[PDB]
Amino acid sequence: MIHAVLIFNKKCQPRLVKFYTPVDLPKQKLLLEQVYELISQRNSDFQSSFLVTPPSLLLSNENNNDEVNNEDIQIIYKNYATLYFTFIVDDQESELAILDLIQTFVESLDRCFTEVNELDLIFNWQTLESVLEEIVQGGMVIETNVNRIVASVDELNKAAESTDSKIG
Amino acid sequence: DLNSKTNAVLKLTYLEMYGFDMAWCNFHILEVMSSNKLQQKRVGYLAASQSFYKDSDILMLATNLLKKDLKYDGNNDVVKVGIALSGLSTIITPSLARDIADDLFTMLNSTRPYIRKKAITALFKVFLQYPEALRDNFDKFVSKLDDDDISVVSAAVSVICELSKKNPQPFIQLSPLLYEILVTIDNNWIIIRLLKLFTNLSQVEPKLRAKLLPKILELMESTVATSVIYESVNCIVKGNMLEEDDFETAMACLERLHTFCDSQDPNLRYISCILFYKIGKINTDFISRFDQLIIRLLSDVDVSIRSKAIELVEGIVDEDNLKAIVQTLMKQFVDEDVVILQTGSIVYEKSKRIPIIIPENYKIKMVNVIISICSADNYSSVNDFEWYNAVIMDLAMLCQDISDKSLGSKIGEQFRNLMIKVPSMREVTIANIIKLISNDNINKQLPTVLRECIWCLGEFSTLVENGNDLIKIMTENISYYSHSVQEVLILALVKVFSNWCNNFQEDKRFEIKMVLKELIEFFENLSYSSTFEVQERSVEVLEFLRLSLEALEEDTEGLPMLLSEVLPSFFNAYEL
Amino acid sequence: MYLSFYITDTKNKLIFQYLLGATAPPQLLEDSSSDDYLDHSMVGRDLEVYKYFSVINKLNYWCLASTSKSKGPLDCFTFLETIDRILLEYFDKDKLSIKKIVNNYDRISLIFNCCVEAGEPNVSDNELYVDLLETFHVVFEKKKSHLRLLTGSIHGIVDVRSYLNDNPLVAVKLNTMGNDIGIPSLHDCVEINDGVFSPSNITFIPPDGKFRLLEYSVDLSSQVKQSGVRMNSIGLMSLHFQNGLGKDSDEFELSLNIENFKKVSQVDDLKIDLQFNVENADPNEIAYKIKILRNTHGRFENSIIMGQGQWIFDKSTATGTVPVLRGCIEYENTGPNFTKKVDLQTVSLEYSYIGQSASGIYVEAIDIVSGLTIGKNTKLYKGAKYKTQTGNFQVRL
Amino acid sequence: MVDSIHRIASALDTAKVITREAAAVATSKLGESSYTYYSQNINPQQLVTLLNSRNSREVRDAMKRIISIMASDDDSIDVQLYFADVVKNITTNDTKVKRLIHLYLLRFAENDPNLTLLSINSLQKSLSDSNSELRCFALSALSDMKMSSLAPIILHTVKKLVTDPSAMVRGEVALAIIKLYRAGKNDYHEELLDILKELMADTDPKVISCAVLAYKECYADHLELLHGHFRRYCRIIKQLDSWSQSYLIELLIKYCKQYLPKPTVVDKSSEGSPRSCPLPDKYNEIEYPSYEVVNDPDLDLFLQSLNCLIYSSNPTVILSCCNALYQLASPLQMKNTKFIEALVRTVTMTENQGNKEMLLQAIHFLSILDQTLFLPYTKKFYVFPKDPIVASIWKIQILSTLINESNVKEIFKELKYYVASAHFPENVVIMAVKSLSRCGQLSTSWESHVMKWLIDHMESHNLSASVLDAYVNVIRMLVQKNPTKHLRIIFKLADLLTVQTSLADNARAGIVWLFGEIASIEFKICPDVLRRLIQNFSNEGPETRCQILVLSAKLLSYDIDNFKQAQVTGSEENNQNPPYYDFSGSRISQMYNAVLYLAKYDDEFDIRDRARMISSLFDSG
DSSP states (O other), X not given: OEEEEEEXXXXXXXXXXXXXXXXXXXXXXXXXXXXXXXXXXXXXXXXXXXXXXXXXXXXXXXXXXXXXXXXXXXXXXXXXXXXXXXXXXXXXXXXXXXXXXXXXXXXXXXHHSSSOOHHHHHHTHHHHHHHHHHHHTTSOOOOOOHHHHHHHHHHHHHHHHHHTTTTO | OHHHHHHHHHHHHHHHXXXXXXXXXXXXXXXXXXXXXXXXXXXXXXXXXXXXXXXXXXXXXXXXXXXXXXXXXOSSHHXXXXXXXXXXXXXXXXXXXXXXXHXXXXXTTSSOHHHHHHHHHHHHHHHTTOHHHHHHHHHHHHHHTTSSOXXXXXXXXXXXXXXXXXXXXXXXXXXXXXXXXXXTOOOHHHHHHHHHHHHHHHSSOHHHHHHHTTTXXXXXXXXXXXXXXXXXXXXXXXXXXXXXXXXXXHHHHHHHHHHHSSSSOHHHHHHHHHHHHHHHHHOHHHXXXXXXXXXXXXXXXXXXXXXXXXXHHHTTOOHHHHHHHHHHHHHHHHHHOBHHHHTOOOOOSOSSSOOOBOOHHHHHHHHHHHHHHHHTTTOTTOSOHHHHHHHHXXXXXXXXXXXXXXXXXXXXXXXXXXXXXXXTTHHHHHHHHHHHHHSTTTTTTOXXXXXXXXXXXXXXXXXXXXXXXXXXXXXXXXXXXXXXXXXXXXXXXXHHHHHHHTTOTTSOOHHHHHHHHHHHHHHHHHTTOSOHHHHHHHHHHHHHHHHHHHHHHHOSTTHHHHHHHHHHHHHHHHHO | OOEXXXXXXXXXXXXXXXXXXXXOOOHHHHHTBSTTOOOOOOOOBTTBOBOOOEEEEETTEEEEEEOBSSSOHHHHHHHHHHHHHHHHHSSOSSOOOHHHHHHHHHHHHHHHHHHHSSSSOOOOOOOEEEEEEEEEXXXXXXXXXXXXXXXXXXXXXXXXXXXXXXXXXXXXXXXOSSSOOOOEEEOTTEEOOSSXXXXXXXXXXXXXXXXXXXXXXXXXXXXXXXXXXXXXXXXXXXXXXXXXXXXXXXXXXXXXXXXXXXXXXXXXXXXXXXXXXXXXXXXXXXXXXXXXXXXXXXXXXXXXXXXXXXXXXXXXXXXXXXXXXXXXXXXXXXXXXXXXXXXXXXXXXXXXXXXXXXXXXXEEXXXXXXXOOBTBSOOOOXXXXXXXXXXXXXXXX | OHHHHHHHHHXXXXXXXXXXXXXXXXXXXXXXXXXXXXXXXXOHHHHHHHHHSOOHHHHHHHHHHHHHHHHTTOTTSOHHHHHHHHHHHTTSSOHHHHHHHHHHHHHHHHHOHHHHHHHHXXXXXXHSSSOHHHHHHHHHHXXXXXXXXXXXXXXHHHHHHHTSOOHHHHXXXXXXXXXXXXXXXXXXXXXXXXXXXXXXXXXXXXXXXXXXXXXXXXXXXXXXXXXXXHHHHHHHHHTSOTTHHHHHHHHHHHHHHHHOOOOSSOOTTSTTOSSOOOOOTTTTSSOOOSTHHHHSHHHHHHHHHHHHHHHTTOHHHHHHHHHHHHHHOOHHHHTOHHHHHHHHHHHHHOOOHHHHHHHHHHHHHHHHHOOTTTGGGGGGOSOXXXXXXXXXXXXXXXXXXXXXXXXXHHHHHHHHHHHHHTTOOHHHHHHHHHHHHHHHXXXXXXXXXXXXXXXXXHHXXXXXXXXXXXXXXXXXXXXXXXXXXXXXXXXXHHHHHHHOTTOOHHHHHHHHHHHHHHHHHHTTSTHHHHHHHHHHHTTSOHHHHHHHXXXXXXXXXXXXXXXXXXXXXXXXXXXXXXXXXXXTTHHHHHHHHHHHHHHTXXXXXXXHHHHHHHXXXXXXX
């Protein structure tokens, strides 16, 4: 189960966090901070993409890849052009499941937001969210098909636009 | 106004996320969920799903509302249905579950894959709470599990998986269907999941594991991914599926790992390396196929990889392999080592100079390995014994930097063994030892090495002509030494002098006499150690020596005999 | 070679470190909660690095030195002390608490450097007021109704704050109230030349700065015996714990007469901490209740939980007046596991006075010497202030 | 290890406080950026120019910075010129300047001999100036130079500066004369003496602290001179700041180790004489002998001083003094009672731990050298409750030192009472053992009570392996001093071993040895013990086996002579019997044979080797 997804821009700013389960918000915040931190230390070429960590590397510093861990929490990072997507999963969700979901998410985002910028993501946080949800649901990514996702997003955009002061 | 509603909802959601009375917000969220706009419905639903936990009245209301929305055509019907279901699923009560199931059941039969997916996911969450509902809905799942749409199937599966986590018994019932779906899926993520599910069912039910294993490995063979490959491997290694019947599966999985390890990505590498090792502990044959892979990983800079390799090297060694490995490690460590010994830098590629890199614990492990390698078979086959001897001396040096004393101990023991074996090399070893001792660096930290050296020399003093320099070394260094060492040195020296005195006759030579005298003075000094035992041990030796001297003064020929005569006498007197 | 100095708090946390020069890289520490405890560590490798350590605790700060190889341990201890003092003068004076250190950690480093610059450790070395502060501490042993001063230690510091214009000299005459006053210890700005200055006299040269003029430690056991002093006031505080107890109660009477304090100047804050051993008896065993303790001029607050009394006497009670602190201890037990025994243990009373003499060093006269005459313009100030502390009175029963 | 350690350290350091000097600029005021200038190049020009400016104040600033840059090895930085300029500026009449300049000089010398020489010349010129404040500092630097070539200079100066009447100058001329001898010794000693003398006789604490730090050096070698000089030093210490006192301690320690003027015949006839005291021969006051050291106002003054310092309320001065008092002492010095009383007083005064431990230790060291002194203080060191395992351990060591015969009972009572009573940790029990051991070494009458106490603890408790190792070592020591109580001690231990077939390797080792050792006293019985051991050796650890051997061996011997004549067997002479002959080759042999065989089966060589020899020698009679 993905318990949360965080999308950050290249300058480490969080932009979206989704939490599929309740977890305590203070914990989520802390985690998001630590993950950000490591990300910063990791190089742009590394950007790590991931930080799995035994807890003890939670942070431990001595070999600075000390990764981050928090025990029971694996952190998967993905860098695309300019956004970073971090997915925090419980120890019971598989890394691949998390990666796939990420990859699919990213592809969709790129298709929908061909150029995503940070500002466009913010405003359209709901749109980004919707896509993320659809993908996720019943734990399940149920359409996997990038063409279906792309359509769905267009449908949602049409809705929100139709509503927009309730939205904008 | 709809835009205002959206705002209210945002605020309520933020309040519910805090840990606030959700019951009070429910009424409002319920009204918003009745707004025709689909976005507002979605946000409302999200809130209620966050809120419902515990309050049953609220839940009941929220349910009624969601139901209405599900029934309404809805025309963005997919989205509305979709959200509502998620929503309902995240609500759990037995009453609600009862309602929801009926709704979900209907929605499972909608055409649109989006809806079907959501519906499935919902029934998952529901079942996560209420088993009776499951029982009733169990049938539908079975029908849905058979829909043509890969995303729907994937969902059905995940759901059955969760339900196994909570109920395994019902699903050990459906396992066959799951096995039939996995056999029909094209999609990698779907395959990956199905694989996990079976792993989950395996912890409960080995029978399933058997049926599914072969479904895994066929799927890995058809998917490329990479994750499906890793997965099959992790599942194989996990369920402990493996058991041996499953070796064949493991093999395929390994072969796929080896192909991948052989991709440049550290994530895939590490994962493979680990999986390899684990398998190797379990299956040496596989390892022999994967030595090459290991050696290549040794040149990788990633500490987890390195450590994983060294651990692999220990169970693989062949002679050609040994020599290669040894040299490679020795070289690496002169070039890979330092970083964490010095700090703890994170790794870099770039410095062209490279920060360089091994932890302290890696170093210790390396040395330990080397020693084992030299002693296995027995490496009667380092062909070049010279290299070993060198390596050992080298390690000792670097470790002096580490301490951890234990490194230093293990190394010493090994050296002793090498010397005992390979009579050639002895002379080389002795010379080096003597030099290392007179180089203070061994004295620092290293009492064990000193103790060993002491032993080696008493034994081999017979090889060495100049048993004088050795002994003048040792005598000068005795004052710098720990009590254990002092005890050892004392004991050795005495063991030696006995050998010399047997050979002295050259003249008796005056030198032997002087050397004895020196040893005596020293031991007297050690008779003043704070530990009574040691003190007594030294005093005994002092007397022993003094004797030999007297004997030499009065004789030469009679010295060996005299020593066996006098020494015991003294010893008994003291003890007596 | 490198030297390094570190300063740690009582809770082993490093507060300051300094490295001088060069290339530079559990039982005692565990114990340091006790205040006295760290002793040496050898970081050691043959780079002899030697280490050494020394630690100094002053005013809650611990100072650790290291040296590299040679210098000797004692040399490192001397450098540590001078550093400590400098830290007191610099920061003005009153405290170097960990909090202060931390905030001033750098100010400490700067000092260290100066000491080393000068090359050498530089070595390590109109109105007048004399404010004698005295902290007594006395270990009494009760035997038979009378408390016999078994040990004690009165520590006097004598500070003096001046306002001359130049540097005249001061003679201070201390009086013995036949207690040979024997060792006054004098501050680096002070001289006590040899019996020229008599044993009762002290000569001090200005600093502008507050200066501790003389510290005096008098071991009460011999003094009191020599002088006959059952402290009738001060220090001998007589606590009478009456057993004849019932299973829950007991009564103890403590009187702190201040007959011998008339010229002892004000007592700024007498604090009495009575410990009822509850450490070895489990506070449930010792539920004790202190019912009434009556001071005529102070305040009592009980801490049962913790197993303690604290009684704080405010400075107004001064002369002849005798604050009597009576009261009753009732050991309430909810367990049966209390056997009605509370080993009654040690009641430490710490007094602080102001303006009086630790040994009886009451300064009876202070005179000025420089070719000066009386009313050549020299006046008497107010508000030197000394402090004195030892450890602590103890009355055993 | 070291890497990580240093890494962390540095980090914290530098960072605090805002890198030293970069923070030094940041907090300057408008003109607060100076720091960053000289930090970010003040520059040599700024320095040189500032030195060539003729104003004593400007020379100061320039001197300060200069000193830093020189220290940094900014290498770029002629230090020769600064050196030169600074040397000329040394001749300025300002004290602050002279001070800095002296500091600088000492720096350069650390790197460069020529400059070292110049700096020395300058110091000579200024030393010949009438200004005593300068002539002083100047002479000081000459002393921190390390060099032997600078001696002929430094001397001519030192001579002129002693011959100056000034107290300041007299302080410094000592520092020099000292750091001088430390190097070019002969040409210089005649003068360097008649000098240091007139000096020491100064009044100013900053002059005394200096001659001290001096005399401490020159004399390492020329101690006859030092004496007549060392006196005022000890007198002075009594009158002085607590810092100036600790210093005098370090010296008084060194001097003594050097002038013990030798005992050589010690004129005990000097006056009122202690061992006697010389005065120096070259002064010839009726040569007053050497041991000067204990009598002579110099040494004696030292001891008395040390005391006052300890009485002086400063714990440092107290610990340090204790160390010095331990070294001088002809034991006649510590018997002083004062040293002890002072220590004990400190102990109770001390609040601080580094101290408590030090105190408890001191008391031990002093008891060692002097027990009879601590006796009135024992009841004082009955343990303080608050204290840890190490403290309770130290209290035990003290009791062990204080034992008189009349007091001993009082002590033992406290101990035994502790072992049984306290919930004493195993570690404490270990020490309590080492003590009681050392106690009996001194008393014989009380030894029995001690041993019995020990054994009773061992026989009974299944004691821990560490404890067993200790006890075994102790029992061994006592047996070594009191062989009469020894026999019982052995039998008692034998039984314990025979029961414990499980014992620890180190225990078996001790237990066995003790029995080798005691066998002389009653090696009639020892065969019984050795028998059990052998029988059970085969199931034991190596070290244990080794000890078991040597101790079979010894046991065998002691009794060869006693066995042999007894063993030279069925020689009749042995069935004849004095006392030991002992049933000898048979009883002992039967034991050794078993032992040897058993040792051979152990891995350790030393065990086997000894076992082999033992058998050979034994066998041959």
